[PDB]
């Protein structure tokens, strides 16, 4: 393991891709994990992951891969919360796809049922968090700096009015406590873990003033990174209801600038490394505008040394969220001008490989 700062290491990051709706797919109720502890990987309609999916993306200069992973349903009870071995082994396999090919990999805790930002459940959540991250840190203890741990995804007060608006004091307290537990746990684990780079999100990982202003970030730990998700401008990118737009317009452009400036103000200008662990714009039969939007977003986080990771859920059509970029089945980039835009805005040579016909 190199003994490098997060800020130095981040300089090796081009831009990234999420294996979304895969190891994060949560079908605890629909499936029977007891009977098949790895079936959840394909429960949201994505094929079982192969090394060849990563290699197509690496051919496109993507070199950071986030593997959102939902652990809930795959571990036992108190007090050990022992992670099922078949699940841990398959997570390991999926991590090695990018890792063995020389890229960055982020492994997290994703759609967990037990780590919501409420004070009634917090003691228990800390306990689970300590037990879960110990096991994970042990399993991967000899992995080098390319393997990054993101402690929690978007912890928040699920199903309340403040779930998404950036929280309240209860939620902020809960998130900051869970983050400290994660950091402590991994820092005191064996192998390279004391030197491993660690991501921690603000409340809901939201690009939001409420979350930003109440986010506690460690002092004198050079190897910690702030995790933000920012599907901005939401109208263009993520909105499926009433004010949705399919053009990247001047209001879109100004809403995105404003969010990028909030990140800049909170993180970059304060000497804190951050990664945009998720962002995307849904397919609205509008590849041209997504291309313009993608290059613009990428130029501006690049202009400030912040890498971003496309959220790819494998979904291209229908009325849910259509964030697919790689067709994992035929191994094609479906929206080649969007990859060209990521390359161009990162300052790389444009070269789109495996473009669909």
Ligand X SMILES: OC[C@H]1O[C@@H](O[C@H]2[C@H](O)[C@@H](O)[C@H](O[C@H]3[C@H](O)[C@@H](O)[C@H](O)O[C@@H]3CO)O[C@@H]2CO)[C@H](O)[C@@H](O)[C@@H]1O
CB of 282 to ligand X, least distance (A): 9
Which two three-digit tokens encode residue 271? 């000497």
Between CA 249 and CA 306 the distance in angstroms is 23
Binding status of residue 172 toward ligand X by CB under 6 A: no
Binding status of residue 313 toward ligand X by CB under 6 A: yes
* C-beta of 109 vs 137, nearer to ligand X: 109
Q: Which residue has the tokens 């002092």?
A: 219
Binding status of residue 312 toward ligand X by CB under 6 A: no
Q: Which residue has the tokens 């891709």?
A: 17
CB of 320 to ligand X, least distance (A): 6
SS3 282: coil
* C-beta of 112 vs 145, nearer to ligand X: 112
Binding status of residue 153 toward ligand X by CB under 6 A: yes
Between CA 147 and CA 96 the distance in angstroms is 10
Binding status of residue 22 toward ligand X by CB under 6 A: no
User: How far is residue 243 CA from its own chain's centroid?
Assistant: 26
Which two three-digit tokens encode residue 101? 């090919």
CB of 323 to ligand X, least distance (A): 5
Q: What is each CA distance from 221 to 187, 274, 344, in whole angstroms?
A: 10, 14, 33
Binding status of residue 323 toward ligand X by CB under 6 A: yes
CB of 219 to ligand X, least distance (A): 28
Q: Which stretch, 77-85, 125-133, 239-247, 314-322, contacts ligand X (CB under 6 A)?
A: 314-322
Q: Which stretch, 116-124, 142-150, 247-255, 313-321, contacts ligand X (CB under 6 A)?
A: 313-321
CB 252 within 8 A of CB 236: yes
Between CA 99 and CA 143 the distance in angstroms is 9
Chain residues binding ligand X by CB under 6 A are: 20-21, 24, 44-45, 153-154, 229, 278, 313, 315, 320-321, 323
């Amino acid at each position: 393991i190199r003994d490098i700062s997060s800020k130095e290491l981040i300089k090796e990051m081009n831009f990234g891709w999420n294996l979304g709706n895969t190891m994060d797919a949560q079908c605890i109720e629909y499936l029977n994990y007891e009977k098949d502890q790895t079936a959840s990987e394909t429960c949201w309609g994505n094929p079982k992951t192969t090394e060849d999916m990563f290699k197509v993306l690496i051919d496109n200069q993507f070199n950071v891969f986030r593997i959102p992973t939902t652990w809930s349903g795959h571990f036992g009870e108190a007090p050990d919360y022992k992670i099922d071995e078949k699940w841990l082994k398959r997570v390991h396999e999926v991590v090695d796809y990018p890792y063995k090919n020389g890229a960055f990999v982020i492994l997290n805790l994703h759609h967990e049922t037990w780590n919501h930002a409420f004070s009634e459940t917090l003691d228990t959540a800390k306990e689970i968090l300590e037990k879960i991250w110990s096991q994970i840190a042990e399993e991967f203890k000899d992995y080098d700096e390319h393997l990054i741990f993101e402690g929690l995804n978007a912890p928040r007060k699920n199903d309340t009015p403040v779930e998404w608006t950036g929280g309240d004091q209860e939620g902020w307290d809960a998130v900051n406590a869970m983050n400290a537990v994660f950091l402590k746990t991994v820092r005191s684990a064996g192998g390279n873990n004391p030197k491993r780079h660690l991501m921690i999100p603000p409340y809901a990982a939201a690009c939001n003033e409420n979350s930003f202003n109440n986010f506690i970030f460690p002092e004198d730990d050079d190897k910690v990174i702030a995790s933000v998700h920012a599907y901005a401008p939401y109208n263009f990118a993520l909105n499926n209801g009433e004010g949705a737009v399919d053009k990247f317009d001047a209001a879109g452009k100004r809403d995105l600038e404003w969010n990028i400036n909030l990140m800049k103000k909170r993180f970059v200008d304060q000497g804190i490394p951050m990664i945009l662990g998720e962002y995307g714009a849904m397919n609205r039969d509008n590849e041209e505008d997504r291309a313009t939007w993608a290059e613009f977003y990428m130029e501006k986080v690049t202009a400030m040394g912040v890498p971003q990771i496309w959220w790819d859920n494998g979904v291209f059509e229908g009325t849910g969220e259509r964030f697919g970029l790689l067709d994992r089945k035929n191994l094609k980039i479906v929206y080649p001008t969007i990859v060209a835009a990521l390359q161009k805005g990162r300052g790389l040579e444009v070269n789109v490989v495996h473009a669909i016909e």
